[PDB]
């Protein structure tokens, strides 16, 4: 039912406070399963989800080998970036990278991803054809010709089409009980009088997984986008997520308002209304 594995790398320089820190985390959809931190007492990749723990020591040491190598490569990227942007060695900078493969119900690659950002700004990204690059500026163009000359896209393509999807399929199998289980949101509408003429109707969605969800208020069948307050979906801490949408309505007219909830864990879109 469409899944993806993603790795997020962050490297940050800190002049006067040691070598640049490198942190890596891996996810399958909205479930983190691994982590690596160069700042840990004894840097080693650590499990963050139950199902991954059963992997053998070969997997874990290979992971640590890859991450230690990546740690040094990013320290070099930070040094190289100063040159590309004529920056001083006195400032702190950040390199971020995302890798990922999306797979369809049948397990075949829907698409691969590989993007870089320096100091929070898009730098270079592998195109969807997994064969070319898009550089954001003249420094990234340098990296592009450099990567084209070494045919980096081809090696990345192999990983994205091979190992990535193969391991994702394996993770989905081993973590089936959770990774392939959608938890529908528990929903209810609360009422909060704000004035004698107005009141707040808040539509809640709790304990749902995955994070993707749609909550909307309709006034007589019309969406109240511009007048709806929607908070960013937030993690509960138990793997599930939460979200709410609120609207201020004239006292007495609340029955003209309906809250609509769409989630993949629901047979069909829900419709709620305040029930006094």
């Amino acid at each position: 039912g469409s899944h993806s594995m993603r790795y997020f790398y962050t490297a940050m320089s800190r002049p006067g406070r040691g070598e640049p820190r490198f942190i890596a985390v891996g996810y399958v959809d909205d479930t983190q399963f691994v982590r690596f931190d160069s700042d840990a007492a004894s840097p080693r990749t650590e499990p963050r989800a139950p199902w991954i723990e059963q992997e053998g020591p070969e997997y874990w040491d290979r992971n640590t080998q890859i991450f230690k190598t990546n740690t040094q490569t990013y320290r070099e990227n930070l040094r190289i970036a100063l040159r590309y942007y004529n920056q001083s060695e006195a400032g702190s900078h950040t390199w971020q990278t995302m890798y990922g493969c999306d797979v369809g119900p049948d397990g075949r690659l829907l698409r691969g991803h590989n993007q870089y950002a320096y100091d929070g700004k898009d730098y270079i990204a592998l195109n969807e054809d997994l064969s070319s690059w898009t550089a954001a500026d003249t420094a990234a163009q340098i990296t592009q010709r450099k990567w084209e000359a070494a045919r980096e896209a081809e090696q990345l393509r192999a990983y994205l089409e091979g190992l990535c999807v193969e391991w994702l399929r394996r993770h989905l199998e081993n973590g089936k009980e959770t990774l392939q289980r959608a938890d529908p949101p528990k929903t209810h509408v609360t009422h909060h009088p704000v004035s004698d003429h107005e009141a707040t109707l808040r539509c809640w969605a709790l304990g749902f997984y995955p994070a993707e969800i749609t909550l909307t208020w309709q006034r007589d069948g019309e969406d109240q986008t511009q007048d709806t307050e929607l908070v960013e979906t937030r993690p509960a801490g138990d793997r599930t997520f939460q979200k709410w949408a609120a609207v201020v309505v004239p006292s007495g007219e609340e029955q003209r308002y309906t809250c609509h909830v769409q989630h993949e864990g629901l047979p069909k879109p829900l419709t709620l209304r305040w029930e006094p």
Partner: protein
């Protein structure tokens, strides 16, 4: 460049005085990644506070969840205190059982 964090303070489960719960402070949309977050109980800082592993969204902004086990009461006040390079002074956000 630099992005100031968004803050949400709330509990894992609907709050019920006397019942053990989890207090959360979710910070997102910030850049750079260095950030200081404190969970407060009646103005004081809770000692045993854990947090998630640094990660970021597609717009490259970072996010982190700070959490601590707790048992809400009628009078106890809880809040989250955040400091980031984009903030002149620490930002405090009170926990609202209805938010």
């Amino acid at each position: 460049i630099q992005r100031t964090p968004k803050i949400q303070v709330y509990s894992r489960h609907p709050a019920e005085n006397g019942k053990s719960n989890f207090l959360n402070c979710y910070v997102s949309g910030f850049h750079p990644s260095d950030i200081e977050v404190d969970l407060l109980k009646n103005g004081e800082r809770i000692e045993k506070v854990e947090h998630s592993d640094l990660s970021f969204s597609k717009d490259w902004s970072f996010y982190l969840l700070y959490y601590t086990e707790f048992t809400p009461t009628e009078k106890d006040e809880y809040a989250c205190r955040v400091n980031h390079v984009t903030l002149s002074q620490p930002k405090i956000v009170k926990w609202d059982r209805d938010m």
